[PDB]
């Protein structure tokens, strides 16, 4: 996260770190949506251009974390993966369209003050909150500039008008994406960066005061560049796929 700040303890209890077994390293961000399911970006697990194609046994899920590098004894819980599910129409060849994947855990994780699932939006929540100007929140242990942070970083960013998102890049933007971030003329800044991929873009509903994950950190050209914005997978648009996988394999 670029230009964000340290997260408060228990501020993002659904935050998940995707951890590579060997070499031991941070692979991506992710989120807890139930005691057995974790949501992330498909490119965190499959991206042929960079010869990335992880299988279940290559990684681990660390939940309830705050510190990036430390083993948080008595706080974080480490889970193994039972199965990975990538959207069948995830477009890694062109523009990361449908950048979403699910991971089922071998055993249920116990909730605590530091571990708690985030909600997934229904049609009305998405229609009501996914509006230009409305701010969401992005969290991650990714790079601070285009070294690494000591603890989870957080930044609030405004959703941007679709025409503006499109005119900021040469990449083909789809309805399964939305972008967020400040304009150069707005002064404030902030953006997700390398390592933040797969992390959640959340919003707190003013209707029922619950947090909903509206997006997944997907891509950006550089980090926090003026005139550029961060792009996120539109979670509601792909919820039918999410429900299908969980109904069938859950």
């Amino acid at each position: 996260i670029v230009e964000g700040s340290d997260a408060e303890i228990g501020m993002s209890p659904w935050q998940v770190m995707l951890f590579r077994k060997s070499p031991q390293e941070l692979l991506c961000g992710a989120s807890l949506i139930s005691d057995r399911w974790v949501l992330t970006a498909a490119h965190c697990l499959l991206y042929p251009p960079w010869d990335k194609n992880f299988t279940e046994n290559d990684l681990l899920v660390r939940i309830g974390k705050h510190s990036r590098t430390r083993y948080e004894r008595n706080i974080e819980k480490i889970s193994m993966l039972e199965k990975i599910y990538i959207h069948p129409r995830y477009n890694w060849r062109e523009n990361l369209d449908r950048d979403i994947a699910l991971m089922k855990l071998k055993k249920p994780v116990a909730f605590s003050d530091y571990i708690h699932p985030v909600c997934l939006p229904d049609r009305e929540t998405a229609a009501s909150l996914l509006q230009a100007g409305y701010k969401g929140r992005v969290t991650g242990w990714g790079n601070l500039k285009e070294g690494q942070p000591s603890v989870l970083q957080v930044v609030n960013l405004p959703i941007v008008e679709r025409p503006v998102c499109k005119d900021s890049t040469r990449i083909r933007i789809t309805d399964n994406m939305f972008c967020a971030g400040y304009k150069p003329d707005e002064g404030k800044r902030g953006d997700a960066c390398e390592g933040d991929s797969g992390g959640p873009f959340v919003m707190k509903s003013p209707f029922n005061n619950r947090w909903y994950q509206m997006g997944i950190v997907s891509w950006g050209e550089g980090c926090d560049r003026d005139g550029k914005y961060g792009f996120y997978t539109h979670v509601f648009r792909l919820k039918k796929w999410i429900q299908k996988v969980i109904d069938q394999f859950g």
């Binding site: 303890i9 228990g10 139930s34 003050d113 699932p117 409305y134 701010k135 929140r137 957080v154 005061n209």
Partner: peptide
Amino acid sequence: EADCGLRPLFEKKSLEDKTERELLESYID
């Protein structure tokens, strides 16, 4: 879960984090 999105150390105890108000203030419509 019927308890999704309610944080143990925040919503559950009726405590607000340092910047959530920024989000609420942006939901002007």
